[PDB]
Write a protein that binds this ligand. Structure first.
Ligand code: GSH
Ligand code: GSH
Lengths: 142, 142
């Protein structure tokens, strides 16, 4: 695949995602797809939602209440769930209240219940581990 | 079902949809679901994308290039395609260039190729027929 990851995130989380997650990954040599930059309306290749996920090794979701509660983010979750499995990566930027994910997102719900995510932390020491573990998970097979 | 239709439309088409389609249908006694009014972030029942479609007899899409070319609208199309069949209703507000719908929306593509939509017209006479035919299709069985 030409991209290591397609990244999805809420508008609320855009500043953090662009300044920390995307900056770090791209500075570290990963090739990233994301719609805000790479979706081109009307373009026959780049102007549809299948392009990024079909051409990325992993799909990474930045999760927070703002993401889970958004109509548009829920549609994006639905799409990844139903299209995409080892290729899914969940980053918990802010804790999700219990049972706040709609019950019909049963795959995402099982992943969270099974503690298969990486959790952001404000502490330098934990953030250092976070970035190493995020690089590791991006390089796993599918 | 408590609602006759869940309605999806692009931001570009919002003014026309609210002032003509929604006004007419609601004045004419139809009960309509749509996220701009009826999606309530954080609400355990009303704050997820399954609520409207699970509780509406029909799903109606207002189609135009602005709809087909939008990332968010494509996600909404994907969801209806994969969740929802006789329950789907397509209203063509503005002509779609040939092959502009992404190829993986194969159900929507077959519906358009098979001429199963209602087309808006600026002419009073054709609009009169349009509204009668739209009421008729909303009342068909699934
Ligand atoms: S998770 C879906 C939305 N995210 C974004 O808007 C981030 C940028 C987009 N990916 C883009 O512009 O391409 C989101 O937060 N939903 C909007 C809302 O508040 O409902
Ligand atoms: S078709 C998806 C978007 N439609 C709307 O924004 C209409 C109102 C929403 N249903 C709502 O606020 O709940 C759309 O046009 N996408 C935004 C874009 O330009 O990409």
């Amino acid at each position: 695949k030409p991209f290591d990851a397609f990244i999805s995130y809420s508008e609320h989380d855009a500043d953090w995602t662009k300044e920390h997650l995307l900056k770090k990954l791209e500075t570290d040599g990963f090739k990233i797809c994301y719609h805000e930059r790479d979706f081109k309306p009307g373009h026959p290749v780049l102007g549809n939602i299948f392009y990024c996920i079909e051409n990325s090794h992993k799909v990474l979701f930045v999760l927070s209440p703002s993401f889970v509660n958004s109509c548009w983010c829920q549609y994006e979750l639905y799409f990844a769930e139903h299209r995409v499995q080892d290729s899914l990566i969940m980053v918990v930027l802010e804790d999700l209240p219990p049972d706040s994910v709609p019950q019909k997102f049963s795959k995402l719900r099982k992943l969270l219940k099974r503690k298969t995510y990486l959790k952001w932390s404000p502490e330098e020491h934990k953030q250092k581990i976070f970035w190493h573990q995020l690089a590791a998970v991006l390089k796993t097979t599918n």
